[PDB]
Symmetry: D2
Subunit: 234 residues, 4 copies
Amino acid sequence: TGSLSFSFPKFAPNQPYLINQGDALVTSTGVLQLTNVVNGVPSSKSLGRALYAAPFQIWDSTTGNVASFVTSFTFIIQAPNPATTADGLAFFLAPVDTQPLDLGGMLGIFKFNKSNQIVAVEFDTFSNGDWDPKGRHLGINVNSIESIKTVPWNWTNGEVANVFISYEASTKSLTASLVYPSLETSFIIDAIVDVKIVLPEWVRFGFSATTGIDKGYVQTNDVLSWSFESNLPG
Amino acid sequence: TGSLSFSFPKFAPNQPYLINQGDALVTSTGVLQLTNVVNGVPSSKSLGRALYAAPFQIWDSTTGNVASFVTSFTFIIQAPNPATTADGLAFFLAPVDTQPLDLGGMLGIFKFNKSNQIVAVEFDTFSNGDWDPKGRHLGINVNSIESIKTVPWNWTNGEVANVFISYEASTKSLTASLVYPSLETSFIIDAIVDVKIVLPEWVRFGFSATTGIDKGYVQTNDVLSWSFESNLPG
Amino acid sequence: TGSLSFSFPKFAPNQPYLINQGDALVTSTGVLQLTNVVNGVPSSKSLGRALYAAPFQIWDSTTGNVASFVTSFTFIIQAPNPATTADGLAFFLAPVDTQPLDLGGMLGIFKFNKSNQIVAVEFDTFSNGDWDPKGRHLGINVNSIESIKTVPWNWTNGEVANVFISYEASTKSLTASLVYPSLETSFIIDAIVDVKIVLPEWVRFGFSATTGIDKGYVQTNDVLSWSFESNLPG
Amino acid sequence: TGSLSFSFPKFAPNQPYLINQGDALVTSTGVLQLTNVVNGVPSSKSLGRALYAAPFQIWDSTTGNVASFVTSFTFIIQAPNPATTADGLAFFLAPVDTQPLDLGGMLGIFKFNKSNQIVAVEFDTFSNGDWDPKGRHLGINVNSIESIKTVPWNWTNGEVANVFISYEASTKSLTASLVYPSLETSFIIDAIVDVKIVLPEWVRFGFSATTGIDKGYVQTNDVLSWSFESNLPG
Ligand SMILES: [Ca+2]
Ligand SMILES: [Ca+2]
Ligand SMILES: [Ca+2]
Ligand SMILES: [Ca+2]
């Protein structure tokens, strides 16, 4: 039982409230730069992740209760060539000792090890014909790179996107939405996810992002703000 | 400056935390029944509204700051004949002394009086060819029954719908989403709304709903739960 | 089950988030003036109370759970003659339809009617030899003007006092503290209070204050800010 | 700018939400055992500390704003010989890289290095004639083992104590209270503390405790629960 909440209007660099993995870094301007950028140009074969320093209890084995939570963040994905973007950015939950996995289409969160359980909401900028539908999309993933559900997403180059994710334990309902405030465009996806049967009691959480493996398929994956709130009923 | 938040898993009847208007009532089972139902069958020409007992400050004239808020609720709309549904349910903000207005397509919140300023998110179950696009839809309305924006909505008879509405003051961005947890279907709409130039400093808020005027065009408009949270920066 | 929280840095006049009773009023400067003041001088035989517009559920008969809550406020009591002060200011919980009671030493909250159940934390500025110990004191009262416990209080004329009250349901522990930030002085009291056996499921809450009945025994009873938070486990 | 809050009804062992230092450990029963205990008997010359995994921003150099926060916890101090208890338990704020300092009377938080800035609320069970008044007491400390203020404390062997600490940035007022719910006894202390001029922008926080250096002067220093909430205005 317990709760956790926080809010960061921007990110302060060199402060241990984030666990940076891979190429991830926080700029002097307060931006969480998940993937490498050289002179403004995003680099290929990059992978970066950022986890909140503390994990939270998503369910309790003694009471059997499951936590409900919400998280919101803003992010920007900018690409020199909007026709060739890859690979995506995702918010995810995983074991406390979670470490970066495969590059590219695996978004750094997938690579079946029953110890690498993971639930994620992905903003996929590149269609992987081997497991992706068609075109850019929002996706909800449980233990694999193949989403349990996807919805089309009209990505807008360099535009600030507001994301909201909520999980209602009582209905095991995970909802994810993306809105471009300046453009008044919006997208949403929902799926049933039984976190109690997927994840361990305690989990770390945050962001992961990768750029494409092939030349040209690059984009930035910058998070600008982040708030979170969870509550596990006693 | 200030804040307000609350959560009601269900509604207790005969308790002054709600201001009931029109035909609205709270059942012994804890359901907020906005429109009349006779022996399970919704009645026509019904109008009911429910406001939280206390208003909240949405903006401050001294500091010029604007509040950000979020609200979530679950509701059900059941109709004997799914081909003929009317008129809709809405969440709205208005002056503290707000009173029910016109029936039917006006959803009880519209009837131009600069004192009847109102912002609402509507779940419209009937297309009014005079100001509505086509088919059922989600809508964001500012001072008039004609929405500044609408998106198609696939209503599901008697199914529990989860709604989430958020307002980010910094971007004047109002977002509304509806999800059917059991069906994993979801809809969303977003629009720029400048509450500071539309509403007074203090506003009351809640639900309003109406049934059709013509025979047969009926439906229930029942709210099952409601949570709210606002924060006006100092 | 449910929750409620709010925060008011100051009080806006003519806004229905407060239910004013007796002589209570909100000044143009945002001060909650509980008792009458004429040209700066507090009047005798005055009684004023202020309740939050909405009640909250302090316990649930279905689950049997009890709510925990906290409230904080700042107040000032100024008197022309510091040797003759009366009668006091109190924070209290009572039935939703609660109305002002007796003047003077009864602090407007006492007058045994099993329907007038009340729990209060009092800041008593006048010793009533018939039921009060000796000198000014903090007190916790349950259903009567005679406190279940009192602690000495060194009141400071016109000084801003910060009050914090907390109720831990699990231990039925009610704690009340008063601090004068500028003076670094502090006082505290604690007592076991079984709200489930004292109050009804839903209660309204707020402030009550009275001035003395006899000439000279006067003081202002002004509240400057107020925050509240309750949570009733499901 | 930002915020952080959490609540732990008890402590789960082997979970990275706490940074354990010195002898500190979490029992299988969920108790945060700060100092060593051998077969129920507390050991001498022990020192243990526990910090929340993430730091929080207590003030911002860009806006100049200061955060307000509150924290509550329950703890027990049990000693074989109640006549000889040492040394104490404290809640403290310090630089993010804070490491345990001196044993015994220094409570593991003191040892003047302008980089070892620290603010703490101490529950001192042993009077150090060299810098302590007389008898057990509550104390507020800023950069040194000599408290800026102390108040007498009647410690009760093995009794659960509820602690509440609040910091109001606007008045630079730090308040600390201790109550024994079962005994209805209470103690409180308050002092002006200018955190902006004492601590760095970001700080880690938590508990520290030590047992006496001399034989016999021992006690347990067990924390049972902990909640925290901070808000740094933008
Ligand atoms: Ca892909
Ligand atoms: Ca319509
Ligand atoms: Ca009295
Ligand atoms: Ca000492």
